[PDB]
Amino acid sequence: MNIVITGAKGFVGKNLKADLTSTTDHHIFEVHRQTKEEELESALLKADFIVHLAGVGSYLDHVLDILTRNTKKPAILLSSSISKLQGEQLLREYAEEYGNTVYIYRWPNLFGKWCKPNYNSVIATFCYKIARNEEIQVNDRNVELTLNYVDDIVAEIKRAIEGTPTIENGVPTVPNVFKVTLGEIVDLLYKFKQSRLDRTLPKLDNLFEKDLYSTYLSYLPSTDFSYPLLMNVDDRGSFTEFIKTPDRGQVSVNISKPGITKGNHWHHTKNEKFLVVSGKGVIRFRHVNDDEIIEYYVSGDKLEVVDIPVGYTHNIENLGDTDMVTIMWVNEMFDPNQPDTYFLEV
Amino acid sequence: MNIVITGAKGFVGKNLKADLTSTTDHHIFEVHRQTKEEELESALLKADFIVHLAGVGSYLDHVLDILTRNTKKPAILLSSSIEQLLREYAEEYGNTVYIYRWPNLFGKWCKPNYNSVIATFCYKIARNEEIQVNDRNVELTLNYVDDIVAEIKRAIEGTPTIENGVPTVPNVFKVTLGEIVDLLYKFKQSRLDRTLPKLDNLFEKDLYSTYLSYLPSTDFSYPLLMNVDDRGSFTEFIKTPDRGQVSVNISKPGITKGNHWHHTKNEKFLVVSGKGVIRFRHVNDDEIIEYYVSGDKLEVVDIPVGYTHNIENLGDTDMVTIMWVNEMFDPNQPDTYFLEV
Ligand SMILES: C=C(C)c1ccccc(=O)c1O
Ligand SMILES: C=C(C)c1ccccc(=O)c1O
Ligand SMILES: [Zn+2]
Ligand SMILES: [Zn+2]
């Protein structure tokens, strides 16, 4: 199928173009302000489907006029919004005079990667500014925004292309509409930034937050994709926290130099998992009231997880000639009021 | 203080004993069935606080009778469940008596195939043994041993938890057998699917730690699946529906991996052993951005959407990278496109 995308260099166009050329065999005719009038016409008259992303307005009228001479009666997709609605009745009359299926959508504000900041998306501007430690302006935190993520826009458009749009009360409607306050948005973005300092992760079964997180990351300066962890270092090795959550535990990285033993503690309720990913050694266990010592000989050649059960004192020792690197998951963030850690030599 | 724990070899006793000797300077007098009558009496008459764990009955009456001759009028703590007489004792001899009404209890060090159905389920389930559930809808009322211990320590210091004028251990749980069993089978099945329990659910958190204490000594570890080839390996470690997934990538010397991008999926790389480079290119651009990283200096590299990226080992040894991804792999939305940086 020959698919024309007008406004193809825009936020949505670029997203759609990349997707269609990645996931279909359709011939994409990009139209934009560098297109010559000849190639606009040529493309329109060959078209099977027209995805119109530029405004309603004189440009569209011109595109529509050319399409009256396209003998295949290609379907046309556009959005009438800008919160005002323009041109709708005229476009229904066009569809009915010339036959073309015309899908009029009423897209709300949009967000996602590749949207130009300091232009006409407030979320692009907040992401851009916040990632660059630039001051933002929030007149009122309680303003509600109605939003669609670009992936859903793209997917709804693809569904229309293959003849199965999403209809609601007799109107094409992209799903996964989000209704959120500015204050909730801004708070999430500042949270994403602060997480490089506190190691926390977003809540990724919240669809809006998930979408916004990926969006925010696309605005990072090229020089800013990495960030330092805090390596607590001494002549025994190091210990470095990587990620913390309130509900799925915390992962850290322990490193022990040759000949080094660490640990010799137990808890009542706190528990861990060790996974040795480089080097070799031994994890030892003893029941607080017993003398039986249980040893697990482990190494990065064979990845196995060792649960650290409660009520056992345990230590970990490097038995090789290189650094021994262990990933260490713990069931809960450290709480100064309930450290739940007791020193006892295995 | 001199603190007597009757029934000290029991489930609660052993828990309490280990805690008190770990977090206080108090002199603990364990009494139990190996205590001689002389040592019972001696200990009781010296006592400042009596934590009675053997429950009500002729044994307790005998303990109470001895304590009428303890000049210091020590406080006494017990649980009446399985009363008026004990209120009358307190009022005749002066001693502060805390009557609790503990429901069923669970936690580590409880003897299985005995008096605790949760101990039995943990024990059995960890050993791949058949369990009996007559009715899944039976509701159990429960306290975790840590809360029992803590409430007792609070009473020792003179500040118990009172409700409707009765000592009550908090964090009472009300749960069906079916919910308990389903969580335990889940904990086991997680060794196969890499998932983690929901640890801001207090009961599930407590139960998870409890379950782990029942693992056979030979069963503390479990294999991960190392997808291995001549380039290295890739091994999933942990998966969650809400905080992403962590895996371990290993590349041999000279090896490049990746050269893909996503729309919405994203990752974090953390090189913990060896050294190399993580590369990035915007899908519509030619600018290649490179991050030179190694295990000598732990830094996280976010993998942002809309950039194709690869990772290459530039050293002598295996290059070990921990890789967090924002979502479990979904066959209907793999959201991964091959593109050479
Ligand atoms: C709980 C931590 C941070 C830790 C760290 C290093 C080595 C052995 C341990 O058992 C351990 O618990
Ligand atoms: C998403 C995974 C599993 C992965 C694994 C190895 C190397 C490089 C990658 O970019 C990567 O995405
Ligand atoms: Zn530990
Ligand atoms: Zn990747």
Author numbering:
A (entry chain B): 1 to 57, 71 to 95, 106 to 369
B (entry chain A): 1 to 57, 71 to 95, 111 to 369
What does the published report state?
In S. aureus, the enzymes CapE, CapF and CapG catalyze the sequential transformation of UDP-D-GlcNAc in the CP precursor UDP-L-FucNAc via the intermediate compound UDP-N-acetyl-L-talosamine (UDP-L-TalNAc). Structurally, CapF is a homo-dimer displaying a characteristic dumb-bell shaped architecture composed of two domains, each one catalyzing separate enzymatic reactions. The C-terminal cupin domain of CapF catalyzes the epimerization of the compound produced by the upstream enzyme CapE, whereas the N-terminal SDR domain catalyzes the reduction of the compound afforded by the cupin domain, requiring one equivalent of NADPH. CapF is a metalloenzyme containing a Zn2+ ion in the cupin domain crucial for catalyzing the first chemical reaction, and also important for the stability of the enzyme.
A construct lacking the loop 57-70 at the N-terminal SDR domain (CapFΔ57-70) was employed for the structural characterization of the enzyme-inhibitor complex. The crystal structure of the complex of CapF with inhibitor was determined at 2.4 Å resolution. The asymmetric unit contained a dimer of CapF bound to two molecules of inhibitor (i.e. the stoichiometry was 1:1). The molecule of 3-isopropenyl-tropolone is bound deep inside the active site of the cupin domain of CapF near the Zn2+ ion. The carbonyl and hydroxyl groups of the tropolone ring are found within the coordination sphere of Zn2+ at distances of 2.2 Å and 1.9 Å, respectively. The seven-membered ring of 3-isopropenyl-tropolone makes extensive van der Waals contacts with residues Phe262, Lys285, Gly286, His288, Phe297, Ile339 and Met351 of the cupin domain. Superposition of the coordinates of bound and unbound CapF revealed a shift in the position of Zn2+ by approximately 1.4 Å towards the tropolone ligand, resulting in the disruption of the coordination bond between Zn2+ and the residue His290. Taken together, the interaction between 3-isopropenyl-tropolone and CapF seems specific because of the combination of strong coordination bonds to the metal and the high shape complementarity with residues of the binding pocket of the cupin domain.
